[PDB]
XYZ file of N, CA, C and O in Angstrom:
512
model
N -7.116 5.713 -11.226
C -7.897 6.680 -10.913
C -7.211 8.171 -10.959
O -5.992 8.112 -10.975
N -7.955 9.271 -10.861
C -7.321 10.596 -10.944
C -6.323 10.529 -9.693
O -6.290 9.582 -8.962
N -5.415 11.483 -9.736
C -4.404 11.530 -8.743
C -4.973 12.153 -7.270
O -4.291 12.258 -6.235
N -6.368 12.402 -7.337
C -7.045 12.954 -6.322
C -7.449 11.775 -5.311
O -7.895 11.919 -4.189
N -7.345 10.588 -5.905
C -7.567 9.236 -5.395
C -7.045 9.360 -3.905
O -5.948 9.727 -3.829
N -7.916 8.748 -3.087
C -7.371 8.725 -1.674
C -6.590 7.536 -1.234
O -6.972 6.381 -1.225
N -5.274 7.887 -0.875
C -4.329 6.708 -0.419
C -4.281 6.537 1.009
O -4.441 7.603 1.809
N -4.017 5.399 1.444
C -3.831 4.873 2.796
C -2.622 4.332 2.886
O -2.217 3.293 2.194
N -1.627 4.835 3.661
C -0.297 4.376 3.871
C -0.124 3.839 5.110
O -0.322 4.304 6.195
N 0.034 2.398 5.157
C 0.210 1.533 6.492
C 1.631 0.938 6.690
O 2.305 0.250 5.850
N 2.237 1.451 7.818
C 3.438 1.011 8.351
C 3.535 1.308 9.795
O 3.024 2.421 10.188
N 4.172 0.569 10.645
C 4.374 0.725 12.086
C 5.485 1.813 12.335
O 5.764 2.089 13.601
N 6.136 2.068 11.277
C 7.365 3.044 11.393
C 6.809 4.472 10.831
O 6.595 4.524 9.526
N 6.708 5.417 11.509
C 6.299 6.683 11.141
C 7.147 7.360 10.052
O 6.745 7.851 8.991
N 8.482 7.129 10.271
C 9.430 7.612 9.313
C 9.186 6.970 7.854
O 9.326 7.721 6.833
N 8.953 5.678 7.702
C 8.677 5.054 6.626
C 7.498 5.588 5.855
O 7.351 5.916 4.715
N 6.286 5.932 6.736
C 5.127 6.286 6.158
C 5.325 7.826 5.606
O 4.778 8.071 4.661
N 6.211 8.647 6.271
C 6.414 9.937 5.702
C 7.277 9.947 4.514
O 7.103 10.762 3.440
N 8.169 8.874 4.510
C 8.870 8.535 2.986
C 7.828 8.480 2.003
O 7.802 9.031 0.956
N 6.884 7.456 2.217
C 5.848 7.152 1.366
C 4.878 8.307 0.982
O 4.539 8.535 -0.298
N 4.521 8.980 1.966
C 3.641 10.197 1.790
C 4.469 11.169 0.908
O 3.773 11.709 -0.090
N 5.797 11.388 1.205
C 6.527 12.465 0.412
C 6.684 12.000 -0.951
O 6.496 12.777 -1.918
N 7.139 10.646 -1.229
C 6.984 10.172 -2.691
C 5.729 10.402 -3.460
O 5.758 10.709 -4.518
N 4.562 10.165 -2.772
C 3.337 10.137 -3.325
C 3.199 11.679 -3.737
O 2.722 11.740 -4.699
N 3.527 12.470 -2.667
C 3.379 13.788 -3.036
C 4.097 14.326 -4.255
O 3.587 15.018 -5.159
N 5.364 13.786 -4.311
C 6.194 14.199 -5.579
C 5.554 13.715 -6.771
O 5.801 14.531 -7.781
N 4.852 12.589 -6.733
C 4.247 12.094 -7.902
C 2.832 12.903 -8.338
O 2.327 12.602 -9.395
N 2.379 13.748 -7.342
C 1.272 14.522 -7.526
C 0.070 14.124 -6.614
O -1.113 14.568 -6.987
N 0.228 12.969 -5.814
C -0.879 12.394 -5.082
C -0.833 13.109 -3.757
O -0.004 12.763 -2.828
N -1.898 13.975 -3.496
C -1.998 14.834 -2.255
C -2.914 14.375 -1.255
O -2.917 15.025 -0.231
N -3.885 13.467 -1.792
C -4.889 12.913 -0.783
C -4.294 11.585 -0.093
O -4.418 10.577 -0.603
N -3.589 11.908 1.152
C -2.998 10.677 1.665
C -3.175 10.666 3.219
O -2.959 11.710 3.983
N -3.536 9.700 3.816
C -3.908 9.479 5.184
C -2.862 8.179 5.480
O -2.519 7.494 4.702
N -2.591 8.314 6.897
C -1.694 7.098 7.348
C -2.319 6.331 8.437
O -3.300 6.707 9.145
N -1.973 4.971 8.539
C -2.295 3.995 9.545
C -1.180 3.392 10.146
O -0.230 3.157 9.369
N -1.135 3.272 11.414
C 0.015 2.640 12.095
C 0.183 1.163 12.198
O 1.146 0.756 12.720
N -0.962 0.606 11.687
C -0.948 -0.974 11.737
C -2.191 -1.449 11.041
O -3.252 -0.542 10.799
N -2.462 -2.703 10.688
C -3.378 -3.217 10.029
C -4.768 -2.970 10.552
O -5.720 -2.665 9.992
N -4.817 -2.873 11.980
C -6.033 -2.725 12.656
C -6.447 -1.319 12.459
O -7.679 -0.900 11.926
N -5.596 -0.375 12.644
C -5.707 1.171 12.383
C -6.192 1.281 11.050
O -7.068 2.236 10.587
N -5.475 0.562 10.024
C -5.864 0.635 8.521
C -7.327 0.334 8.323
O -7.962 1.010 7.583
N -7.752 -0.874 8.786
C -9.146 -1.428 8.523
C -10.173 -0.535 9.339
O -11.372 -0.368 8.776
N -9.839 0.029 10.459
C -10.851 0.723 11.321
C -10.944 2.087 10.226
O -12.135 2.467 10.237
N -9.846 2.555 9.616
C -9.964 3.680 8.770
C -10.632 3.365 7.357
O -11.486 4.237 6.828
N -10.290 2.139 6.853
C -10.757 1.781 5.489
C -12.374 1.655 5.700
O -13.155 2.221 4.672
N -12.866 1.070 6.811
C -14.306 0.751 6.776
C -14.977 2.090 6.822
O -16.151 2.236 6.520
N -14.201 3.237 7.271
C -14.780 4.543 7.341
C -14.993 5.029 5.723
O -15.566 6.240 5.610
N -14.840 4.147 4.806
C -15.163 4.312 3.374
C -14.522 5.554 2.750
O -13.863 6.359 3.421
N -14.301 5.681 1.444
C -13.782 6.580 0.684
C -12.315 6.475 0.283
O -11.838 7.522 -0.397
N -11.508 5.387 0.415
C -10.186 5.250 -0.048
C -10.101 4.523 -1.240
O -10.854 3.616 -1.649
N -9.100 5.038 -2.107
C -9.105 4.355 -3.360
C -7.691 3.608 -3.554
O -7.519 3.099 -4.799
N -6.822 3.485 -2.593
C -5.571 2.800 -2.921
C -4.783 2.544 -1.426
O -4.828 3.465 -0.528
N -4.310 1.288 -1.274
C -3.610 1.103 -0.115
C -2.111 0.681 -0.225
O -1.881 -0.112 -1.177
N -1.193 1.260 0.398
C 0.097 0.945 0.345
C 0.383 0.376 1.669
O 0.332 1.093 2.708
N 0.712 -0.839 1.807
C 1.038 -1.324 3.131
C 2.241 -2.060 3.360
O 2.906 -2.821 2.415
N 2.906 -1.995 4.343
C 4.164 -2.618 4.936
C 3.845 -4.026 5.020
O 2.717 -4.445 5.596
N 4.724 -4.860 4.830
C 4.636 -6.342 4.883
C 4.690 -6.863 6.258
O 3.847 -7.428 6.960
N 5.965 -6.484 6.831
C 6.285 -6.802 8.294
C 5.784 -5.551 9.280
O 6.316 -4.557 9.281
N 4.671 -6.049 9.996
C 4.110 -5.140 10.814
C 3.500 -5.779 11.994
O 3.203 -7.091 11.884
N 3.542 -5.303 13.204
C 3.161 -6.010 14.435
C 1.721 -5.951 14.625
O 1.024 -5.191 14.288
N 1.347 -6.990 15.333
C -0.257 -7.194 15.704
C -0.844 -7.990 14.393
O -0.884 -9.087 14.370
N -0.966 -7.214 13.415
C -1.422 -7.760 12.102
C -0.578 -7.395 11.126
O -0.369 -6.231 10.722
N 0.252 -8.271 10.575
C 1.039 -7.964 9.571
C 0.381 -7.504 8.122
O -0.756 -7.518 8.036
N 1.154 -7.169 7.205
C 0.514 -6.771 5.896
C -0.166 -7.778 5.162
O -1.261 -7.386 4.464
N 0.164 -8.991 5.389
C -0.425 -10.354 4.785
C -2.033 -10.410 5.255
O -2.915 -10.405 4.459
N -2.017 -10.151 6.577
C -3.372 -10.367 7.101
C -4.356 -9.190 6.609
O -5.490 -9.322 6.365
N -3.782 -7.936 6.481
C -4.436 -6.671 6.061
C -5.066 -7.065 4.768
O -6.368 -7.038 4.513
N -4.269 -7.487 3.837
C -4.619 -7.611 2.404
C -5.629 -8.728 2.305
O -6.614 -8.568 1.608
N -5.562 -9.784 3.163
C -6.646 -10.920 3.178
C -7.897 -10.244 3.639
O -9.091 -10.642 3.052
N -7.873 -9.504 4.686
C -9.188 -9.023 5.328
C -9.807 -8.007 4.353
O -11.028 -8.126 4.069
N -9.015 -7.350 3.678
C -9.498 -6.400 2.576
C -10.181 -7.051 1.369
O -11.290 -6.900 0.971
N -9.311 -8.059 0.725
C -9.844 -8.830 -0.263
C -11.074 -9.652 0.256
O -11.948 -9.993 -0.758
N -11.244 -10.173 1.411
C -12.447 -10.868 1.671
C -13.661 -9.803 2.070
O -14.648 -10.297 2.233
N -13.145 -8.565 2.256
C -14.336 -7.635 2.613
C -15.021 -7.100 1.477
O -14.745 -6.311 0.670
N -16.298 -7.822 1.267
C -17.102 -7.438 0.130
C -17.107 -6.128 -0.327
O -17.234 -5.748 -1.544
N -17.292 -5.003 0.558
C -17.203 -3.634 0.248
C -15.958 -2.953 -0.249
O -16.035 -2.041 -0.885
N -14.810 -3.679 -0.074
C -13.474 -2.979 -0.440
C -12.607 -4.146 -1.105
O -11.405 -3.996 -1.169
N -13.345 -5.299 -1.588
C -12.463 -6.367 -2.216
C -11.750 -6.001 -3.373
O -10.683 -6.612 -3.602
N -12.189 -4.982 -4.094
C -11.416 -4.466 -5.226
C -10.457 -3.299 -5.117
O -9.801 -2.776 -6.016
N -10.319 -2.992 -3.753
C -9.375 -1.923 -3.423
C -7.924 -2.216 -3.834
O -7.344 -3.333 -3.555
N -7.202 -1.300 -4.437
C -5.782 -1.541 -5.020
C -4.889 -1.664 -3.688
O -4.925 -0.795 -2.717
N -4.071 -2.605 -3.655
C -3.221 -2.864 -2.624
C -1.822 -3.164 -3.004
O -1.525 -4.203 -3.734
N -0.851 -2.174 -2.727
C 0.461 -2.202 -3.125
C 1.116 -2.637 -1.848
O 1.006 -1.905 -0.855
N 1.887 -3.754 -1.881
C 2.705 -4.264 -0.703
C 4.252 -3.948 -0.848
O 4.783 -3.952 -1.918
N 4.690 -3.287 0.221
C 6.008 -2.891 0.325
C 6.696 -4.005 1.236
O 6.402 -4.417 2.325
N 7.862 -4.584 0.791
C 8.523 -5.712 1.366
C 10.082 -5.406 1.486
O 10.695 -4.731 0.907
N 10.712 -6.090 2.637
C 11.958 -5.793 3.063
C 13.125 -6.381 2.205
O 14.124 -5.902 2.122
N 12.847 -7.431 1.579
C 13.808 -8.104 0.615
C 12.998 -8.882 -0.533
O 11.817 -9.110 -0.427
N 13.692 -9.354 -1.615
C 13.044 -9.817 -2.727
C 12.952 -11.453 -2.470
O 13.442 -12.188 -3.395
N 12.266 -11.818 -1.579
C 12.091 -13.283 -1.231
C 10.871 -13.845 -1.685
O 9.836 -13.344 -1.603
N 11.057 -14.724 -2.681
C 10.013 -15.363 -3.458
C 8.740 -15.870 -2.543
O 7.669 -15.715 -2.808
N 9.185 -16.209 -1.325
C 8.213 -16.600 -0.380
C 7.133 -15.469 -0.177
O 5.858 -15.557 -0.634
N 7.428 -14.363 0.524
C 6.720 -13.264 0.750
C 6.106 -12.876 -0.641
O 4.835 -12.407 -0.670
N 6.828 -12.608 -1.619
C 6.236 -12.081 -2.938
C 5.016 -13.025 -3.448
O 3.988 -12.471 -3.871
N 5.225 -14.493 -3.670
C 4.203 -15.228 -4.075
C 3.049 -15.256 -3.274
O 1.943 -15.084 -3.662
N 3.210 -15.246 -1.881
C 2.172 -15.316 -0.998
C 1.431 -13.807 -1.241
O 0.050 -13.916 -1.185
N 2.209 -12.713 -1.516
C 1.433 -11.531 -1.611
C 0.509 -11.533 -2.873
O -0.677 -11.009 -2.962
N 1.124 -12.075 -3.986
C 0.290 -12.277 -5.313
C -0.837 -13.042 -5.113
O -1.966 -12.921 -5.573
N -0.717 -14.139 -4.189
C -1.590 -15.314 -4.158
C -2.922 -14.669 -3.314
O -4.005 -14.816 -3.512
N -2.552 -13.733 -2.209
C -3.502 -13.257 -1.447
C -4.256 -12.055 -2.152
O -4.999 -11.364 -1.627
N -3.927 -11.834 -3.387
C -4.398 -10.791 -4.360
C -3.782 -9.287 -4.165
O -4.487 -8.409 -4.290
N -2.501 -9.294 -3.850
C -1.873 -7.961 -3.815
C -1.885 -7.419 -5.178
O -1.590 -8.215 -6.097
N -2.242 -6.290 -5.267
C -2.257 -5.669 -6.750
C -0.775 -5.476 -7.276
O -0.547 -5.471 -8.453
N 0.200 -5.432 -6.385
C 1.629 -5.213 -6.716
C 2.479 -5.220 -5.457
O 1.851 -5.090 -4.427
N 3.794 -5.262 -5.718
C 4.674 -5.225 -4.495
C 5.957 -4.387 -4.937
O 6.298 -4.362 -6.096
N 6.636 -3.932 -4.017
C 7.883 -2.978 -4.002
C 8.847 -3.243 -3.033
O 8.473 -3.720 -1.823
N 10.187 -3.324 -3.429
C 11.143 -3.713 -2.461
C 11.747 -2.336 -1.874
O 12.183 -1.590 -2.606
N 11.636 -2.141 -0.551
C 12.001 -0.991 0.064
C 13.571 -1.048 0.319
O 14.149 -2.131 0.653
N 14.330 0.080 0.147
C 13.740 1.327 -0.195
C 13.466 1.245 -1.652
O 14.229 0.674 -2.440
N 12.528 2.392 -2.054
C 12.291 2.404 -3.372
C 12.257 3.960 -3.750
O 12.224 4.899 -2.859
N 12.417 4.206 -4.966
C 12.394 5.635 -5.487
C 11.058 6.109 -5.876
O 10.181 5.342 -5.906
N 10.924 7.468 -6.316
C 9.769 7.999 -6.714
C 9.633 7.384 -8.178
O 8.400 7.121 -8.472
N 10.454 7.072 -8.888
C 10.510 6.538 -10.274
C 9.825 5.095 -10.127
O 8.769 4.987 -10.940
N 10.393 4.381 -9.329
C 9.665 2.955 -9.220
C 8.150 2.997 -8.822
O 7.157 2.437 -9.393
N 7.995 3.835 -7.771
C 6.599 4.021 -7.207
C 5.634 4.416 -8.266
O 4.566 3.774 -8.507
N 6.155 5.349 -9.150
C 5.343 5.789 -10.269
C 5.029 4.588 -11.134
O 3.931 4.450 -11.796
N 5.962 3.721 -11.540
C 6.124 2.677 -12.438
C 4.861 1.845 -11.926
O 4.085 1.356 -12.679
N 4.967 1.309 -10.629
C 4.106 0.339 -10.128
C 2.810 0.820 -10.100
O 1.737 0.191 -10.577
N 2.622 2.121 -9.606
C 1.398 2.668 -9.688
C 0.657 2.764 -11.107
O -0.481 2.320 -11.232
N 1.450 3.173 -12.126
C 1.040 3.274 -13.386
C 0.835 1.946 -13.884
O -0.392 1.584 -14.426
N 1.460 0.664 -13.662
C 1.197 -0.660 -14.000
C -0.101 -1.234 -13.471
O -0.835 -1.729 -14.115
N -0.350 -0.800 -12.230
C -1.582 -1.187 -11.504
C -2.774 -0.575 -12.007
O -3.911 -0.911 -12.237
N -2.665 0.745 -12.138
C -3.649 1.608 -12.692
C -4.102 1.135 -14.126
O -5.364 1.180 -14.517
N -3.094 0.624 -14.836
C -3.266 0.163 -16.131
C -4.279 -0.930 -16.106
O -5.404 -1.014 -16.787
N -4.044 -2.113 -15.428
C -4.967 -3.158 -15.477
C -6.267 -2.852 -15.025
O -7.213 -2.790 -15.918
N -6.465 -2.225 -13.803
C -7.754 -1.723 -13.253
C -8.302 -0.765 -14.422
O -9.469 -0.373 -14.250
N -7.464 -0.230 -15.346
C -7.817 0.697 -16.253
C -8.358 1.870 -15.515
O -9.648 2.274 -15.426
N -7.482 2.456 -14.817
C -7.766 3.679 -14.012
C -6.836 4.783 -14.404
O -7.254 6.122 -14.268
């Protein structure tokens, strides 16, 4: 979708969230809110209006996996783009992310170039 599309960045580390916010900014995406955990993310997403979720995998309370599943099972936001950020390239985590319906995944740390690439690749499919 347009770069006005509203992003939600989920991570229990504020420093990592500002990194993702800053990279999105650099790519031209200025509509960005943050969530400190899956619960805060879902409370916020139910508030409607978001067009893309970038979520950390490893998070306390509700990890990234649970968030993705709740979203994919939520009839109203089941189609919401979800990019998962993971700490290592472990096939376990990756395959489960794909299986749970992750629109894509990235290994942190990542560059603006990669984020752009993933974002473009996903916008591609969705034809956005």
